[PDB]
Structure 1
Amino acid sequence: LTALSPRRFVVLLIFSLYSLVNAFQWIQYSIISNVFEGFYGVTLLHIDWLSMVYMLAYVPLIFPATWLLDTRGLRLTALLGSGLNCLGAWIKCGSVQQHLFWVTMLGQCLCSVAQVFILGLPSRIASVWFGPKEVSTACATAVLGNQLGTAVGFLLPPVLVPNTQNDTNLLACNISTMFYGTSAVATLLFILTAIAFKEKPRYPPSQAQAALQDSPPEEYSYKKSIRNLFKNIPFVLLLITYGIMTGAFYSVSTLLNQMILTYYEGEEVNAGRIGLTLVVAGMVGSILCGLWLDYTKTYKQTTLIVYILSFIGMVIFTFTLDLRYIIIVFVTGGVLGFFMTGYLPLGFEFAVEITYPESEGTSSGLLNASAQIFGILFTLAQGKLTSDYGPKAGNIFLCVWMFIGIILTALIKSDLR
Structure 2
Amino acid sequence: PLTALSPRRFVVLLIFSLYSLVNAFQWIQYSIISNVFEGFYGVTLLHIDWLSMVYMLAYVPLIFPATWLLDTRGLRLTALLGSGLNCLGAWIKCGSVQQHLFWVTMLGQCLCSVAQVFILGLPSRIASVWFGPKEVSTACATAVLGNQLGTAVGFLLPPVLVPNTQNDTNLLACNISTMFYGTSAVATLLFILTAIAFKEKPRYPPSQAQAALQDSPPEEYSYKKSIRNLFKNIPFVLLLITYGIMTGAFYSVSTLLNQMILTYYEGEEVNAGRIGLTLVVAGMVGSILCGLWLDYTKTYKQTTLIVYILSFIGMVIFTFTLDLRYIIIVFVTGGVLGFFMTGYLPLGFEFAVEITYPESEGTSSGLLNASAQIFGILFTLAQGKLTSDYGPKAGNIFLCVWMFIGIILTALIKSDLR
TM-score tier (shorter): over 0.9
How far did 1:19 drift? 0.5
Q: Quick one: distance in 2 between partners of 1:13 and 1:260?
A: 35
How far did 1:415 drift? 1.5
How far did 1:183 drift? 0.3
How far did 1:216 drift? 3.2
Q: How far does the alpha carbon of each residue in 1:121-146 deviate from its partner, in whole angstroms, 9 at most, with x for none?
A: 00100000001110010010000000
Is the contact made by 1:246 and 1:344 (CA closer than 8 Å) also made in structure 2? yes
Q: Quick one: distance in 2 between partners of 1:218 and 1:99?
A: 51
Q: How far does the alpha carbon of each residue in 1:299-357 deviate from its partner, in whole angstroms, 9 at most, with x for none?
A: 00000000000000110000001100000000000000001111111111000001011
Counterpart secondary structure, 2:415: coil
Q: Residues 297 and 206 from structure 1, CA distance in 2 versus in 1: closer, same or farther, beyond 3 angstroms?
A: closer
How far did 1:218 drift? 3.7
Is the contact made by 1:241 and 1:408 (CA closer than 8 Å) also made in structure 2? yes
Is the contact made by 1:27 and 1:150 (CA closer than 8 Å) also made in structure 2? yes
| Identical residues among aligned pairs (%) | 100
Q: Residues 297 and 195 from structure 1, CA distance in 2 versus in 1: closer, same or farther, beyond 3 angstroms?
A: closer
Q: Quick one: distance in 2 between partners of 1:239 and 1:296?
A: 23
Is the contact made by 1:314 and 1:336 (CA closer than 8 Å) also made in structure 2? yes
How far did 1:253 drift? 0.1
Q: Given the alignment of the two structures, is residue 249 of structure 1 paired with residue 250 of structure 2, yes or no?
A: yes
Q: How far does the alpha carbon of each residue in 1:74-126 deviate from its partner, in whole angstroms, 9 at most, with x for none?
A: 00000000000000000000000000000000000000000000001001000
Q: Quick one: distance in 2 between partners of 1:220 and 1:395?
A: 42
How far did 1:217 drift? 3.3
Q: Quick one: distance in 1 between partners of 2:219 and 2:97?
A: 46
Q: Quick one: distance in 1 between partners of 2:216 and 2:82?
A: 26
Q: How far does the alpha carbon of each residue in 1:156-192 deviate from its partner, in whole angstroms, 9 at most, with x for none?
A: 0000000011000000000000000000000000000
Q: Quick one: distance in 2 between partners of 1:129 and 1:408?
A: 38
Q: Quick one: distance in 2 between partners of 1:158 and 1:27?
A: 11
Q: How far does the alpha carbon of each residue in 1:44-92 deviate from its partner, in whole angstroms, 9 at most, with x for none?
A: 0011000000000000000000000000000000000000000000000
How far did 1:414 drift? 1.0
Counterpart secondary structure, 1:133: coil
How far did 1:238 drift? 0.6
Q: How far does the alpha carbon of each residue in 1:270-294 deviate from its partner, in whole angstroms, 9 at most, with x for none?
A: 0000000010000001111110103
Consecutive unaligned residues in structure 2, runs of 5 or more: none
Is the contact made by 1:71 and 1:217 (CA closer than 8 Å) also made in structure 2? no
Q: How far does the alpha carbon of each residue in 1:374-404 deviate from its partner, in whole angstroms, 9 at most, with x for none?
A: 0000000000000010000010000000010
Q: Which deviates the most, 211-220 or 370-379? A: 211-220
Q: Quick one: distance in 2 between partners of 1:401 and 1:148?
A: 27
Q: Given the alignment of the two structures, is residue 4 of structure 1 paired with residue 28 of structure 2, yes or no?
A: no
Q: Quick one: distance in 2 between partners of 1:217 and 1:253?
A: 41
Q: Given the alignment of the two structures, is residue 206 of structure 1 paired with residue 203 of structure 2, yes or no?
A: no
Q: Quick one: distance in 2 between partners of 1:48 and 1:36?
A: 11
Q: Quick one: distance in 1 between partners of 2:249 and 2:136?
A: 29
Where do 1:319-334 residues align within 5 Å?
319-334=320-335
Counterpart secondary structure, 1:132: coil
How far did 1:154 drift? 0.2
State the Cα RMSD in Å.
0.7
Counterpart secondary structure, 2:357: coil
Q: Quick one: distance in 2 between partners of 1:133 and 1:123?
A: 13
Counterpart secondary structure, 1:358: coil
* 1:31 alignment partner in structure 2: 32
Is the contact made by 1:279 and 1:337 (CA closer than 8 Å) also made in structure 2? yes
Q: Residues 228 and 297 from structure 1, CA distance in 2 versus in 1: closer, same or farther, beyond 3 angstroms?
A: closer
How far did 1:297 drift? 5.4
Q: Quick one: distance in 2 between partners of 1:326 and 1:123?
A: 39
Consecutive unaligned residues in structure 1, runs of 5 or more: none
Is the contact made by 1:54 and 1:111 (CA closer than 8 Å) also made in structure 2? yes
Q: Quick one: distance in 2 between partners of 1:339 and 1:368?
A: 19
Counterpart secondary structure, 2:316: helix
Is the contact made by 1:70 and 1:217 (CA closer than 8 Å) also made in structure 2? no
* 2:42 alignment partner in structure 1: 41
Q: Quick one: distance in 2 between partners of 1:362 and 1:244?
A: 19
Q: Which deviates the most, 237-246 or 213-222? A: 213-222
Aligned pairs, number: 417
How far did 1:215 drift? 2.2
* 2:116 alignment partner in structure 1: 115
Is the contact made by 1:40 and 1:101 (CA closer than 8 Å) also made in structure 2? yes
Q: Given the alignment of the two structures, is residue 14 of structure 1 paired with residue 15 of structure 2, yes or no?
A: yes
Runs of 4+ more than 3 Å apart: none
TM-score where L is the length of structure 1: 0.99
Q: Quick one: distance in 2 between partners of 1:409 and 1:216?
A: 39
Q: Quick one: distance in 2 between partners of 1:165 and 1:392?
A: 28
Is the contact made by 1:26 and 1:54 (CA closer than 8 Å) also made in structure 2? yes
Counterpart secondary structure, 1:117: coil
How far did 1:232 drift? 1.4
Q: How far does the alpha carbon of each residue in 1:217-252 deviate from its partner, in whole angstroms, 9 at most, with x for none?
A: 342110111111101111111110000000000000
